[PDB]
C-alpha cells in the first residue's frame, strides 16, 4: 500500500466526481409510501 | 363513529377534537343513541384530517 499513489488519486477523484452528479441527479428523490398512490408525505397518512 | 369510546385513549389528531357522548338505550333504535349531536362515518381507506 505504498505504490499506489497516481491510480488511486484518480480513482478517488472519480469516485468523488460521480458521488457529485449523482446528489445532483437524485437528491431527495429516493423518497416513497406504503402503497404506492400517495406521492406526497402529506398524502402518506392514515391507513390502507 | 368507529372510534375506542373509552376516555382514557385520547388520540387527538391534528384538525380534529372527538366528542365523548353520553348513549341512552332506546326503542326504535334497537342500539344506544345519543340525540344531542350526529355521528359521523369516514370509509376506513379514507383519510380523515385531509
Redesign the interface.
Known amino acids: 500500500i505504498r505504490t499506489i499513489g497516481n491510480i488511486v488519486l484518480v480513482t478517488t477523484l472519480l469516485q468523488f466526481m460521480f458521488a457529485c452528479i449523482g446528489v445532483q441527479l437524485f437528491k431527495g428523490k429516493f423518497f416513497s409510501c406504503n402503497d404506492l398512490s400517495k406521492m406526497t408525505e402529506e398524502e402518506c ?4 | 363513529a368507529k372510534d375506542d369510546l373509552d376516555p382514557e385513549k385520547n388520540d387527538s389528531e391534528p384538525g380534529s377534537q372527538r366528542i365523548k357522548p353520553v348513549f341512552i338505550d332506546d326503542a326504535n333504535f334497537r342500539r344506544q343513541v345519543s340525540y344531542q349531536h350526529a355521528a359521523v362515518h369516514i370509509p376506513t381507506d379514507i383519510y380523515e384530517g385531509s
Open positions: 397518512r392514515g391507513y390502507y
